[PDB]
């Protein structure tokens, strides 16, 4: 699958500095959808501003978790069946924490933003399409967690 190799090659670049890259993703996310900020409630407190989130080790750990789940998806690009059940429960978990399935569209745009910014000219039309398909497949599996 040529799509899979474009994903593998672009991810190599990102995966070298995952927290730095995931930081861009989350900064962009809160800039687009500020109402996601209160959902991260560590030690029973909510973050007042997006910059507060960046000072939180728990929040930064969650960036690492996100980048790890993406890494699993890239590893399993040719077949996400090994990941379907895990991703369904991951959706269920995010439903429980208060995330609306609708917000995963903004997450997608934030992912594509991070990739465009990191890769520059190497973020070709084909690369963008490949990532949009992989992300779509991930969200499809996660969406099963929202009761159906
Ligand atoms: C809309 C954006 C998101 C929000 C508001 C959100 C919120 C949360 C919260 C509150 C937790 C529990 C606290 C914690 O573990 O730090 C969590 C856990 C987690 N998140 Fe997210 N999340 C988002 C997106 C994602 C995405 C897209 C992924 C996958 C690529 C992801 C991967 C994970 C993982 C692996 C955990 C640990 C779940 C567990 O095993 O308990 N997160 N998230
Ligand atoms: Xe952020
Ligand atoms: Xe963790
Ligand atoms: Xe993501
Ligand atoms: Xe993804």
């Amino acid at each position: 699958r040529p799509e899979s190799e474009l994903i593998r090659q672009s991810w190599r670049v990102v995966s070298r500095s995952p927290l730095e890259h995931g930081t861009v993703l989350f900064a962009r996310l809160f800039a687009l959808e500020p109402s996601l900020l209160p959902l991260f409630q560590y030690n029973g407190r909510q973050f007042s501003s997006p910059e507060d989130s960046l000072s939180s080790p728990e929040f930064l750990d969650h960036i690492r978790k996100v980048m790890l789940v993406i890494d699993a998806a890239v590893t399993n690009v040719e077949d996400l069946s090994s990941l379907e059940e895990y991703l369904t429960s991951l959706g269920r978990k995010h439903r429980a924490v208060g995330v609306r399935l609708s917000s995963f569209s903004t997450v997608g745009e934030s992912l594509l933003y991070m990739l465009e910014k990191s890769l520059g000219p190497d973020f070709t039309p084909a690369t963008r399409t490949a990532w949009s398909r992989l992300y779509g497949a991930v969200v499809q599996a996660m969406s099963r967690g929202w009761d159906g």
Side-chain angles (χ1 to χ4, degrees), residues 16 25 63 72 74 76 105 136:
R16 289 174 190 146
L25 190 167
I63 299 178
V74 173
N76 294 88
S105 68

Side-chain angles (χ1 to χ4, degrees), residues 29 36 39-40 42 62 65-66 69 86 90 93-94 97 99 104 107:
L29 186 57
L36 292 170
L39 297 183
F40 294 93
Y42 305 112
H62 179 272
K65 300 177 198 184
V66 174
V69 172
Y86 170 76
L90 191 59
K93 172 63 170 175
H94 285 86
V97 306
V99 189
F104 283 88
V107 171

Side-chain angles (χ1 to χ4, degrees), residues 25-26 29-30 33-44 46-48 50 52-53 56 58-63 65-66 94 97-99 104 107:
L25 190 167
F26 279 86
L29 186 57
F30 293 146
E33 195 169 323
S35 63
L36 292 170
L37 186 63
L39 297 183
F40 294 93
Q41 281 151 7
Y42 305 112
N43 303 124
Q46 78 181 72
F47 298 124
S48 281
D52 294 322
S53 70
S56 164
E58 290 100 325
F59 179 82
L60 297 181
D61 286 337
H62 179 272
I63 299 178
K65 300 177 198 184
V66 174
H94 285 86
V97 306
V99 189
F104 283 88
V107 171

Side-chain angles (χ1 to χ4, degrees), residues 123-139 141-143:
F123 200 59
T124 61
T127 307
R128 170 159 214 128
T129 297
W131 278 102
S132 197
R133 278 175 43 76
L134 178 59
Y135 184 73
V138 169
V139 179
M142 298 184 68
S143 75

Side-chain angles (χ1 to χ4, degrees), residues 1-8 10 112 115 119-134:
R1 202 203 259 184
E3 268 160 67
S4 291
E5 190 57 24
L6 283 176
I7 289 164
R8 289 193 219 281
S10 51
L112 292 172
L115 295 162
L119 297 164
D122 301 329
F123 200 59
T124 61
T127 307
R128 170 159 214 128
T129 297
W131 278 102
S132 197
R133 278 175 43 76
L134 178 59

